[model samples]
Target: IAQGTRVVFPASEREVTLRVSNTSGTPVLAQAWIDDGRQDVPPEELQVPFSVTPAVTRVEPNGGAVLRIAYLKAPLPTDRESLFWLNILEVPPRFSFRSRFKLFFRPSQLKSVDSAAGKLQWKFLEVVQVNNPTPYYVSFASVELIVDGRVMSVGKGMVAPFSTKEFDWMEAASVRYEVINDYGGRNTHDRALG
Candidate 1:
């Protein structure tokens, strides 16, 4: 299956397409579903505002299936982006495989995500901290703390809108970070500890 690491669901769209292909030499059964970021809950037990068409189907080797993902038009917060998880489990004749990725619902009321990354607030006291003030979710591709001309490693994570996250507790002069852009491209940014 060739799919992006994350999915962007535009608010203006009524539905979206998720393609699943069997690159293996044998056929497999593709079962897909979406959940509200719950790992312990089963697909049938979890409730979500979205649905996947042909939830279960067979894909021939080298063949693909077009998954129709449609929103139920349910009441969701338009002030900020909502997040969900997409799961795809493939069962072959011998074994089973599974994968998961994030699905973001971008509200139309929100302006754009182009500047959200740069708008992040960085603070340094006991530990390095970053805050997301915008109404868009900001995910980092890389984060490194520069302390005394040396690049110190930091943990990778995503910050939700109107939330704050703290990194490794260390004294750093500056921080070099990379945000995943709207096009799945990485935009590098650097900031001095304040």
Candidate 2:
């Protein structure tokens, strides 16, 4: 819960740095890496296109270190923004804690709106059709379909790109949705699905 922000990489920068700290009054071993959702690949054999520096290191009490991650190995899709995962493993002498978060890779072409930082854009395509207008993935916190005033299909939803999702239940008119924004918060709204 200490880390409330997601990681973002510049389009032109060759690499980005993330600072992690040990607040306890003791030393701790830290390991940070990026994952592109290849859960099947063990950490030892994971073939991530990007790399993290000082994969393992020691941080003293109240001390911090930098993790330099770069996507220099291969070019990512420049046409659209892409997402990855940041896994941080902290091993104290007595115990350990792990934190994982989303890593956003911004493209040179897809300029982001400064004011749109913690927001998402979405729309209804009638009868289950939907779209994610923003670069960030639009995940539904809740999906409520009400032809008049009634509950329907579920939310806790995940949508990729402008791709469609099925919210239709035989027939519906009003639709409500909640999406996760950049700051790990929710943005909910309602629209007609008719």
Candidate 3:
């Protein structure tokens, strides 16, 4: 294949599938693997709870292969999400390379948007604002300052569970934010500084 990106495996499932195709004009031998999230170790040294069938295969021009990955039922956390990596190595008759992407395994109980969550509050100064209240993690993908009718991004990152976050030099009447829920998705909202 010429292009591919990250993949997500929601943790509520027992098996996930992956496909690799050789759309090029030549044949290629494709090798695939599932790995733990640590990139600092060698492939042979890495361990994970999933197993892949037909770990190696050959794809012809305009053809493809499929991998059925089944979890081996490791005792993953029941309250939080986890992340991993999947790798595919392709070797054409004369060329070779590899590609890897994030494989997120999200806990089923984790909410991407919990309206029942304790409301988030804030403390604003002329120079910066401290987050007011939160009982769980508030992972902000982006925070923007709003003045009159205009919007300006002020920050992007996470506020850990029960921790206050401070922003610098954003003297606006309101703020907008996008937060990442446990599933790696965003929940957006706006709040007034007044």
Q: Write the per-residue lDDT of candidate 2 for residues 44-161, one digit (tens) a residue.
A: 5766667889898788788887788888657677666677888888877776788887787777766653323234333454446665555545557787776667778655656654
Q: Which 10 consecutive positions of candidate 3 have the poorest summed lDDT?
A: 127-136
lDDT of 1 by residue, 99-178 (tens): 98789999987877889989887988576899899999899988888878898778789999999989874554788899
Cα displacement (Å) at residue 34, model 2: 1.2
Give the Cα error of residue 132 in candidate 2, in Å. 3.3
lDDT of 3 by residue, 74-192 (tens): 88766554556788889778768888755656566656426512366655766445463433445577887888878776777655444567776544467787876545577788777
Give each model a TM-score: 0.93, 0.70, 0.60
- Lowest summed lDDT window (length 10), candidate 2: 113-122
Query: Which residue runs does candidate 3 get wrong by more than 4 Å?
Result: 2-6, 10-12, 110-169, 173-194
Each prediction's number of clashing residue pairs = 0, 1, 1
